[PDB]
């Protein structure tokens, strides 16, 4: 049976942004080894 959703269980959890972040984080940290 259907429910009304008030709130997130894990407030800081954001699946989409975490992906964006980690992929970009990897990219720039690869550029570190380009310098090094």
């Amino acid at each position: 049976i259907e429910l009304e959703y008030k709130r997130k269980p894990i407030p800081d959890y954001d699946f989409m942004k975490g992906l964006e972040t980690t992929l970009q984080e990897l990219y720039v940290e690869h550029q570190s080894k380009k310098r090094r």
Binding site: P9, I10, D12
Partner: protein
């Protein structure tokens, strides 16, 4: 009639709860924010079980054989039970029934209480305290009709409460519940009133939020003070009106649905 004893979780238990929610982060977020498939729900049941286990004793995730009497270090529940009988002394003479939803812990508790000179022993289909595995509840119900003149009941864990309440007819005796503060036990307590469509979602959500009291010394102090108070209370004819413990704080504001 049914009274709650709020006991704090150890640093270990909190870490484990934090690790658990983290490991289930995707699954919890999915389940708690919309309709989910059968297999998601299956995985949430494992989350709930694990949370129950941590709330029973963290050493359920110890791989190795350990020396009984290692255990009260990380369980406010074990310490509570120790300090209760310590301050209850040989004067008091009512027979306790304790329900616990784990065979290993039943054995460890039973053996550890004996170790501290407490007349405790396992139930099976007169002592200072019976230790009963919640699986073997169908037998004890018969004997919880005769000794209502003098038989008090302790639920070590909420899982045992859930199990025993549903199977057996409602018990005519004093019921004490050991409920860990901030655990799934606390969450189940606050949403007991419902058991509707949003029950699972809410208890998971609250636990998730809480895991996204203080240190060892302070826990021990609080546990003893709670134990002294309850013992004192039992000595004085178990007055409903002079129950000394505050109730568990309400977590309904941390709900995620309905």
């Amino acid at each position: 009639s049914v009274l709650d004893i709020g006991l704090p979780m150890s640093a270990l238990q909190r870490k484990m709860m934090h690790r658990l929610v983290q490991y289930f982060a995707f699954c919890i977020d999915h389940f708690c924010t919309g309709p989910s498939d059968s297999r998601i729900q299956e995985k949430i049941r494992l989350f709930i079980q694990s949370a129950h286990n941590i709330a029973k004793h963290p050493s359920l995730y110890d791989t190795e054989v350990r020396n009984f009497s290692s255990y009260a270090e990380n369980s406010s529940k074990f310490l509570f039970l120790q300090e209760l009988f310590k301050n209850l002394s040989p004067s008091y003479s009512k027979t306790f029934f304790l329900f616990i939803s784990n065979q290993f812990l039943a054995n460890t508790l039973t053996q550890w209480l004996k170790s501290q000179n407490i007349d405790a022993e396992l139930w099976a289909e007169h002592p200072a305290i019976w230790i009963c595995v919640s699986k073997k509840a169908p037998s004890a119900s018969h004997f919880l009709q005769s000794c209502p003149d003098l038989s008090a009941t302790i639920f070590y864990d909420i899982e045992a409460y859930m199990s025993v309440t549903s199977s057996l007819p409602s018990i005519q005796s004093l019921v004490l519940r050991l409920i860990h503060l901030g655990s799934i036990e606390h969450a189940i307590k606050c949403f007991q009133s419902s058991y509707n469509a949003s029950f699972l979602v809410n208890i998971v959500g609250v636990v998730a939020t809480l895991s996204s009291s203080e240190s060892h010394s302070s826990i021990t102090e609080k546990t003893r003070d709670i134990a002294k108070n309850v013992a004192t209370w039992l000595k004085n004819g178990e007055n409903f009106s002079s129950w000394p413990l505050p109730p568990l704080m309400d977590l309904a504001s941390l709900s995620v649905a309905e």
